[PDB]
């Protein structure tokens, strides 16, 4: 979050165009997505994750 | 007939798709309960009416069970 | 030439700037016209009317070259004869640079300030998409055609102005 | 109100309103619920349509 | 067919009983089924495929949201049924999540 988004502030504050808060936002939520699990490659990884989740809320009871 | 076997064939082209989105939503119907209810949508048939049946007959077989 | 400049001088949806290298080619031939003056009055002379089978041999190179162009394809058959190193030849071709360079130009004063395209022929390098102003014109609603590009421009040049 | 967000400005959570998230088939309340930043205008562009469906996925996990 | 032996039919599917050792969930079938046999509200395909999207979306496939296009498209191409909408509410609204199911190989 911190990473990406301090990156995304300087590069609009820097651009002097409209399209590079259009490439900067494009990138910010390529590295987004792929940091965090929901990407195609990483669905194995988050559907080992779920096999976790389900886990917690079992404690629950 | 013969054509009318291969109508036979048309809708058995259908029944195994239909098989296939029943699999994907995880249901409780088979192959076999889906032909009554494709002959019952040829008639015309409220989804309403049929879940709420469905949801009582499955607690026959475990009320009689 | 004679043939090729009556047609596209009557045919307007060659665009205004087939017309304007018409317009060049009558200024052209407007000088021929001086010579046979002199000429009719002097009346073997293989001389006086050799010099013209170097200018002609130039002009009908050019006029057949030239067609099946318009708009910025157009700008680059003109553009075909500024690869030249004869200052004859060059100078021939300058004042016909000019007058079809203009309408493109005069397109790209309303597309470097205020305007936006409005012409019955295609002359120009946006080829926009009608009705696509809902709020998604800063998405593509004016397409780059390349084929309108003049080639006095660059890709580098052809993209800024967008 | 009744906890310290209140000093951003008006104008920012006014545009926030509460979209319902994707339907389960009768399982919890926390699958449905959603926030939605509206965003319409010049800045329907700037801020891309296509961008926000997958920041609202982000948002979900 | 005929619309009563059609019902009775389906009893016999779902409960592995006798016909004539049943005959009380025959008589609620009817309950329900009667006067009310055609649809109460009109049909529409175009909510419940974007049901079965905002299914297969929450499970984060987007390759399984495409591939249920390409069954609903099989659908409308065999043709041999004129409430392509009946079924699948039906298949929707006895729906559960699975978080699996990996076998489509579909036709």
Redo the contacts between chains.
Sequence with gaps: LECSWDELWNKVQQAQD?DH??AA??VF?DT??SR???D?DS?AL??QL?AVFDQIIELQN | AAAAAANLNAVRETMDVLLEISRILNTGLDMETLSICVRLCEQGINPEALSSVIKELRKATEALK | IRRYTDQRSLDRSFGLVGQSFCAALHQELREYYRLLSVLHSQLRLLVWTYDPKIRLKTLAALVDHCQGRKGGELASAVHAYTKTGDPYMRSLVQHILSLVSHPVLSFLYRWIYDGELEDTYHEFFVASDPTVKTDRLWHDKYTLRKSMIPSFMTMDQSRKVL | RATNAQFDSPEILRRLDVRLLEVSPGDTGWDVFSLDYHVDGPIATVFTRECMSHYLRVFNF | KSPNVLLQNLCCRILGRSEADVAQQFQYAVRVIGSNFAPTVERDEFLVAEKIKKELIRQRREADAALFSELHRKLHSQGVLKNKWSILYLLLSLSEDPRRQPSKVSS
């Design positions: 409209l808060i259009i936002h494009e939520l987004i997505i965090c699990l929901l195609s669905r988050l559907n779920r």
